């Protein structure tokens, strides 16, 4: 098996909280920690960690004979594509710096940087629209037929998150004027909101998913005592993040939402893995190429795993699609019979690897889970999906109206 091609779909790195609203301040008596960068901006530490990942992959790709040990990679050998958010553009710059330092590798973004990128947001940009009847039904089925059903299984994790927050002493909890229950699910009833370009949950679910991610972010960023020192063992970490992981299982991994949102990415990956005459398609980037790096969001990876049926969990990582988490796709050729095979994987730093700023390397690698396409009918011994089967899964998952 000769390794021929590699498409890495990565999440951005450790970033500042995206939002810092007055609801977040009102659910806890304690002050939220400041960050070194503006909201939603990648932090230097996040870049370095992403850089480590860039360095490990370089080594590993050398080892597989895909890249050259010494000096910068050949022209066109590496391609970086990144969404317009600073965090994603910086994450692309950070990866390059680690994969091949001091080489001038361009990070290719959408020209108008203040517009969404259709390749990362085909719904918010007009390419296609979710169907309300089918998307709501399907989300409600996944919830177990109702949102009440869903949030009923969440009371344990809300109890733990209420504790970490010190919710009873919170400005909101005093709803309780001088007759109303303090309970977090009862103060913020969750509500499924589906439209043509967006599906969301308003209430404790959306906010629990956000604050647990902030906790997790504080951990990877090295900040002293995340959760105000109220998170103390991995059990508590896994119980909190259950809320984040669970709000992505429902919204992002529903296929009637995942197939649509992810079709431009499916079409990009598809075109980067197929042996084909050289082609400068999107972002001025010629495909196919050796290593293609795509810097996106947790939603892009969730959508891909829902549409492709790649279900995974990251031992040592409470966040299922953590900062810098990578869905790696590789085309290997079998020399015996000259056939193309596809292999998928989740590469990642464990939360302790982020909080120790551990330097990755061949001998200090990151977590890595090997995935298999549920639907693939043509596997090798290694459990790789044939290029034909993988192509056929993609064509079945993709939603043509949502292609760029
Ligand atoms: K406001």
Residue numbers in the entry: 6 to 183, 185 to 410
Text from the published report:
AppA, the Escherichia coli periplasmic phytase of clade 2 of the histidine phosphatase (HP2) family, has been well-characterized and successfully engineered for use as an animal feed supplement. The E. Coli periplasmic phytase, AppA, is a 1D-6-phytase (EC 3.1.3.2) and initial hydrolysis preferentially liberates the phosphate at the 1D-6-position on the inositol ring. HP2Ps catalyse the hydrolysis of phytate via an obligatory phosphohistidine intermediate. The catalytic proton donor is found in a second, short, conserved motif with sequence HD positioned such that the aspartic acid residue functions as the consensus proton donor in the catalytic mechanism.
The AppA-HET variant, which produces almost equal amounts of InsP5 [4/6-OH] and InsP5 [1/3-OH], shows the greatest reshaping of the active site. The structure reveals the glutamate residue to be found as the t rotamer (χ1 = 168°) pointing away from the substrate analogue, instead forming a salt bridge with H250 and making only weak interactions with the sulfates bound in pockets A and B. Furthermore, there is no low energy (or otherwise) rotamer described for glutamate which can leave its carboxyl group suitably positioned for to directly participate in catalysis. This is consistent with the low turnover number recorded for this variant. In fact, E304 positions its carboxylic group at the back of pocket B forming a salt bridge with His250 and makes only weak interactions with the sulfates bound in pockets A and B. A change in polarity also occurs in this pocket because of the distal position of the carboxylic acid group of E304. The sum of these changes presumably produces an active site able to accommodate multiple binding modes. However, the electron density for the InsS6 molecule bound to the active site of the AppA-HET variant was less well-defined. Given that this variant shows a reduced stereospecificity in hydrolysis of phytate it is possible that the enzyme may be able to bind the substrate analogue in multiple orientations. Consequently, the sulfomonoester groups at positions 1D-3 and 1D-6 of the inositol ring of InsS6 were simultaneously modelled in the primary specificity pocket adjacent to His17 to model static disorder in the binding of the inhibitor. The inhibitor molecules have refined occupancy ratios 0.47:0.53 (S3:S6) suggesting little intrinsic preference between the two orientations of binding. In addition, in the structure solved for the AppA-HET variant an inhibitor molecule was also found at the entrance of the active site, just above the inhibitor molecule occupying the catalytic site, and interacting with K24.
